[PDB]
Amino acid sequence: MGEPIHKIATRGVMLWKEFDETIFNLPKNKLVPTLEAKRDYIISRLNADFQKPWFATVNGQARDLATMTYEEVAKRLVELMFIRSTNSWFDVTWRTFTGDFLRRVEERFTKSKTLSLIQSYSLLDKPDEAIEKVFNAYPAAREQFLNAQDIDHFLSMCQNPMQKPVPFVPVLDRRFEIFFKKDSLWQSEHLEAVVDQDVQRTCILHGPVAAQ
Amino acid sequence: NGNSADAAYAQVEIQPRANIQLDFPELKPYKQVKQIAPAELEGLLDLERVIVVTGFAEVGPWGSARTRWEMEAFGEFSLEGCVEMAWIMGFISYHNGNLKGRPYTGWVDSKTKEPVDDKDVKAKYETSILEHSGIRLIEPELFNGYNPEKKEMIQEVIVEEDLEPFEASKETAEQFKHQHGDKVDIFEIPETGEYSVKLLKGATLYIPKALRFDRLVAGQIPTGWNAKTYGISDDIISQVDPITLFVLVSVVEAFIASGITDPYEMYKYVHVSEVGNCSGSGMGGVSALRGMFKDRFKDEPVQNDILQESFINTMSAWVNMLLISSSGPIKTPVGACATSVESVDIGVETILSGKARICIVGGYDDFQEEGSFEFGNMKATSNTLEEFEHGRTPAEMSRPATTTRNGFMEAQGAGIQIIMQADLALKMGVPIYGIVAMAATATDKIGRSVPAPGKGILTTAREHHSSVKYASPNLNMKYRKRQL
Amino acid sequence: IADEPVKASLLLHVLVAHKLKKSLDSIPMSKTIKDLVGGKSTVQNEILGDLGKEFGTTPEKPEETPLEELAETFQDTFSGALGKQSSSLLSRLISSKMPGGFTITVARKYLQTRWGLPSGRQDGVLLVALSNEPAARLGSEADAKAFLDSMAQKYASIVGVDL
Amino acid sequence: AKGSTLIVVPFNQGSKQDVEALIEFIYDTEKNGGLGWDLDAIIPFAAIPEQGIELEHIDSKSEFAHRIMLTNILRMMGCVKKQKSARGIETRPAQVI
Amino acid sequence: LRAAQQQWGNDFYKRDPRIAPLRGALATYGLTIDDLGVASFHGTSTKANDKNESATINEMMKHLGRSEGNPVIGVFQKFLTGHPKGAAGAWMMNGALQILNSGIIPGNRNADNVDKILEQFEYVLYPSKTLKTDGVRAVSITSFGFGQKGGQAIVVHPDYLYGAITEDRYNEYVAKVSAREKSAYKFFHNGMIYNKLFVSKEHAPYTDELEEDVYLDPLARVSKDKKSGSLTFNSKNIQSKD
Amino acid sequence: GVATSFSRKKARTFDSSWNWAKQSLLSLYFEIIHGVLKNVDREVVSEAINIMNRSNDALIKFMEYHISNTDETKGENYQLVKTLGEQLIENCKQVL
Incomplete structure (x- = not known):
């Protein structure tokens, strides 16, 4: 909302500052055309420097949601939202997001009415076994890119107000400043749930003078 | 025991969503696809001289080639077919965003905007889809009001008593005076500056009358089909003959079947002079021919360039002007019913000559009042009153090879294939649906009936059998592979 | 009403x-x-x-x-x-798409009578009508009156006069 | 099977006009637009159901049903008899089942 | 090399009057006349056409010595679609391809009673219901227009092509198709829900300044422009030694 | 109820058994190869009856070609169709 904040000049915050000077200051008409012009740069610098990485990234290769398989999307969800060190989902609402996705996978690839292989999202507390199980019953979803309808769904779920903001940027659009800046403060206290446990990704609030 | 013990018991049902496939050919492992062909075939064929089909599409009475093939092969729509048909016919549209305060992503009824689920598309629409698809009674809304029950004509009559004067502009009245001569009196009205036209006794007049025509049924592109659905702009729709719209959709949809979403991609591999268009028509833009012959004569407002939209080669032009932007061959054939096979033969020879490496082939034709009428006068089409006498429904009026067959059922649409050199298809990694092994045209012989089918194409099987006592080593691929 | x-x-x-x-x-x-x-x-x-x-x-x-x-x-x-x-163009509009017997004279007289619009305003109302070609010969006299009523509204709207 | 034929004709056994026509059609020569057959068997199984129609409820339906299931079966047998006797056929009787 | 391959592989039977074009077109891929499984007939539903076509296919097959008891299976797609004049054979060709790639042969469901006259043509079978076969190797497409326009096209199963290439070249193709298929599906669904399968081009791939330079260089090719992202002709890749 | 339904023009004739015989054989042949009919299913015997009831020289040649050109090594279902085929040809020859 344009208010000044004093933060430790980490890579994440330097990216933030840079985007405030070059992208977020632009008028609404100029924001969208500027994002495609810089897209390849932004996606690289989110993945390197920030606490919210580019979602659509498979083994370092910067894809887009439309050019990711259903399996790549379900795995990437686990790698950003489930904590290996403490074998649990950082937030229940993130486990819901990932279960809701996997049900959508079953809907898109089932030929007739069936029973979900995920009867309760409690089963996702073993996320590898749940993914193996779903993508064994629907192996077509290992090979196909996301249906355009399922991309639109996924971004609809990323904007759900009754859940914790997703710890990634899924699309460059008018909504990019909110995906970048929303929910910036928790990471500093939960580095286990940040990409490489990298403090340098995070926003830490601190005074210039009190720092002495 | 409360609802707690009966809530963990309660199971979650998954309902299928239509995952429409492009049905690319299924490529086998090399060990298996090496079993069908002889072992000698490897490095025997010049792959620039082999023509393959890398994409195809159509627009016709059962929607696209996907939906038509479902209805041809299985005689019923799958979830995917039923959703595709509902989207084509404009029954359902896609919605992403806020709907009635809740956020909703999926299908909605196009009229009401009520959300529709894919399971419910069959119950809600399939009866409406089957009723307004395929061979069925002629829908006047689809043919500029044309109702074959009430087919408009004009009879010339010599008037026997003077008419009441009517007001007309000066220029209009002058045009009445010129036409009629002394058999009309035009007089200025000083007050208003307009003129009073009085038709006198002996003047020629035209009184509209209606004939009840007997061809009531046709294969018609599903009701609610709309080029705007595929994303063709209004300015293109307002300019071109309806037949052009079937071609533009068939061509983009054939490119998609070839996995070529951007046609300019072809220009990474071939010159702009190596992309042909050999697609043709029998009659071309017959809606534009009606415009220039009939609607102009009746002084209706018809666009000035209607003539260009009539030409059989204008559909291929619009394809090149809106999508392809090639400077390759353009060889528009006119083969009546055999246009599309001639189109392939030209396209094959264009590629084998080296004048192209890729070629859009196919054919297209519209159904309209005047054609329908003239195929009736030639007794080529089935008389629908005789079919109704015999108890036949519209869906059983086209019955080839049958004892009681009594003429053809006129339809409308377009079919397109993309043909390429094999060598370039492999290089580009485009799907390959089949090899065009042969194409040929043939006339018949001396005769006096244009519509009489003859046996000319039998020549494709011509061979000499006088001396066939010992097999020719030319038929033996092992002999040919040795000589190579 | 003043003429322009x-x-x-x-x-x-x-x-x-x-x-x-x-x-x-x-x-x-x-x-x-x-x-x-x-x-x-x-x-x-x-x-x-x-x-x-x-x-x-x-x-x-x-x-x-x-x-x-x-x-x-x-x-x-x-x-x-x-x-x-x-x-x-105005003569084609009237001749081609008006209920029949409803000509320039009785169109202009209906504008002068009901709306009180003189020659210069009438021309304007007919021109905005030429913008909104009904696409079909409208059926009855009452539909023509209703058409000129509605086109006189859009004329008053575009020029900035009151009726 | 080989030699078999199946002719499917619309027919309302409740109409006596239909019964006469159907047997005229079967028996009439192919020149006149018939089958030029001569029946060996008649199997008149046509019938409409009545449920919960006791004596007090016997009306238009039950009287129509009786026409289908008795009266017009007698009239089919009649029509077949008249066509066979017209052609002096006395040694090829139709088995009515 | 190509000229040799053409002489022995593609065009062996052109100077040879003992090989019919129809027999040579199959023989190219090691197929025999008995491998022409399906004949998609014009089959307009007219008295004269359906008999003539049946007689014409039957005589082709009889001359080329197709094995007794091996009729071609007739497909009469027009029972469903009707006859769209110029478009007729294109629909048949679309359906011939769909047959080859599925092995399913559709049935003329309006073939209530096959005409007794057509029984004399022993090399033609007229099915009324769909046959899931174990494979079709080749389909014949015959049209007959007004004005003596006879046409025939043979379409062969695409799996006969891949026997002509090495495993390395086959496996490279299969990788590109898989990738292209995925991108096509991506494009198809996007365009369908957003009504933008058809996208008119605003501009040629060249500017009006490069237009005559591109036309005159046979090796000119488009490349991805960094700014627009669209495929264009660059001045660098026109009359370049590379 | 006594409305006339009957018209001669509406009479549909079916007499083309020569054609359906071949279709019925070829339908069976592929149903056995695709494992839809097994060697225990009675519909194999029923269909064989309906093919013998349509036996003629053209149908026997149709069988002899389709069966004698079955590669039995392609799978067990192909051996089953070739064994049954051979038998049904013998049957069709006797009841010619």
Whole structure:
């Protein structure tokens, strides 16, 4: 909302500052055309420097949601939202997001009415076994890119107000400043749930003078 | 025991969503696809001289080639077919965003905007889809009001008593005076500056009358089909003959079947002079021919360039002007019913000559009042009153090879294939649906009936059998592979 | 109600609008003829021909210059004269798409009677009607009256008078 | 099977006009637009159901049903008899089942 | 090399009057006349056409010595679609391809009673219901227009092509198709829900300045422009030694 | 109820058994190869009856070609169709 904040000049915050000077200051008409012009740069610098990485990234290769398989999307969800060190989902609402996705996978690839292989999202507390199980019953979803309808769904779920903001940027659009800046403060206290446990990704609030 | 013990018991049902496939050919492992062909075939064929089909599409009475093939092969729509048909016919549209305060992503009824689920598309629409698809009674809304029950004509009559004067502009009245001569009196009205036209006794007049025509049924592109659905702009729709719209959709949809979403991609591999268009028509833009012959004569407002939209080669032009932007061959054939096979033969020879490496082939034709009428006068089409006498429904009026067959059922649409050199298809990694092994045209012989089918194409099987006592080593691929 | 001659800013708008087969407001005045028909050279030269037949003398290369400025360029020499093209088009509208026996005279008399609009205003109401070609011969006398009522509203709206 | 034929004709056994026509059609020569057959068997199984129609409820339906299931079966047998006797056929009787 | 391959592989039977074009077109891929499984007939539903076509296919097959008891299976797609004049054979060709790639042969469901006259043509079978076969190797497409326009096209199963290439070249193709298929599906669904399968081009791939330079260089090719992202002709890749 | 339904023009004739025989054989042949009919299913015997009831020289040649050109090594279902085929040809020859 344009208010000044004093933060430790980490890579994440330097990216933030840079985007405030070059992208977020632009008028609404100029924001969208500027994002495609810089897209390849932004996606690289989110993945390197920030606490919210580019979602659509498979083994370092910067894809887009439309050019990711259903399996790549379900795995990437686990790698950003489930904590290996403490074998649990950082937030229940993130486990819901990932279960809701996997049900959508079953809907898109089932030929007739069936029973979900995920009867309760409690089963996702073993996320590898749940993914193996779903993508064994629907192996077509290992090979196909996301249906355009399922991309639109996924971004609809990323904007759900009754859940914790997703710890990634899924699309460059008018909504990019909110995906970048929303929910910036928790990471500093939960580095286990940040990409490489990298403090340098995070926003830490601190005074210039009190720092002495 | 409360609802707690009966809530963990309660199971979650998954309902299928239509995952429409492009049905690319299924490529086998090399060990298996090496079993069908002889072992000698490897490095025997010049792959620039082999023509393959890398994409195809159509627009016709059962929607696209996907939906038509479902209805041809299985005689019923799958979830995917039923959703595709509902989207084509404009029954359902896609919605992403806020709907009635809740956020909703999926299908909605196009009229009401009520959300529709894919399971419910069959119950809600399939009866409406089957009723307004395929061979069925002629829908006047689809043919500029044309109702074959009430087919408009004009009879010339010599008037026997003077008419009441009517007001007309000066220029209009002058045009009445010129036409009629002394058999009309035009007089200025000083007050208003307009003129009073009085038709006198002996003047020629035209009184509209209606004939009840007997061809009531046709294969018609599903009701609610709309080029705007595929994303063709209004300015293109307002300019071109309806037949052009079937071609533009068939061509983009054939490119998609070839996995070529951007046609300019072809220009990474071939010159702009190596992309042909050999697609043709029998009659071309017959809606534009009606415009220039009939609607102009009746002084209706018809666009000035209607003539260009009539030409059989204008559909291929619009394809090149809106999508392809090639400077390759353009060889528009006119083969009546055999246009599309001639189109392939030209396209094959264009590629084998080296004048192209890729070629859009196919054919297209519209159904309209005047054609329908003239195929009736030639007794080529089935008389629908005789079919109704015999108890036949519209869906059983086209019955080839049958004892009681009594003429053809006129339809409308377009079919397109993309043909390429094999060598370039492999290089580009485009799907390959089949090899065009042969194409040929043939006339018949001396005769006096244009519509009489003859046996000319039998020549494709011509061979000499006088001396066939010992097999020719030319038929033996092992002999040919040795000589190579 | 006071009489005015028809402004070239309206007449030119209506001729363009009618020629492109578009609503009067879907075309913006501050946007040139070469941009309107950017594709079809045939249609461009055909509007230029109509502007010639209408106003007589045309400026030098006026197709790249906006409608809004070309209004005032034509306006100087123009003097509330319907002219060959507009007079023809209005006669075709009436002759072709009016209930029958409902001509120029009884259209203008109905405008003068009910709405009290004189010759110069009448011309304007008929021109905005030429923008909104009903596409079918409308059936009864009551439908024609209702049509001119509704087109007199859009005329009052566009010029800025009250009824 | 080989030699078999199946002719499917619309027919309302409730119409006596239909019964006469159907047997005229079967028996009439192919020149006149018939089958030029001569029946060996008649199997008149046509019938409409009545449920919960006791004596007090016997009306238009039950009287029509009786026409289908008795009266017009007698009239089919009649029509077949008249066509066979017209052609002096006395040694090829139709088995009515 | 190509000229040799053409002489022995593609065009062996052109100077040879003992090989019919129809027999040579199959023989190219090691197929025999008995491998022409399906004949998609014009089959307009007219008295004269359906008999003539049946007689004409039957005589082709009989001359080329097709094995007794091996009729071609007739497909009469027009029972469903009707006859769209110029488009007729294109629909048949679309359906011939769909047959080859599925092995499913559709049935003429309006073939209530096959005409007794057509029994004399022993090399034609007229099915009324769909046959899931174990494979079709080749389909014949015959049209007959007004004005003596006879046409025939043979379409062969595409799996006969891949026997002509090495495993390395086959496996490279299969990788590109898989990738292209995925991108096509991506494009198809996007365009369908957003009504933008058809996208008119605003501009040629060249500017009006490069237009005559591109036309005159046979090796000119488009490349991805960094700014627009669209495929264009660059001045660098026109009359370049590379 | 006594409305006339009957018209001669509406009479549909079916007499083309020569054609359906071949279709019925070829339908069976592929149903056995695709494992839809097994060697225990009675519909194999029923269909064989309906093919013997349509036996003629053209149908026997149709069988002899389709069966004698079955590669039995392609799978067990192909051995089953070739064994049954051979038997049904013998049957069709006797009841010619």
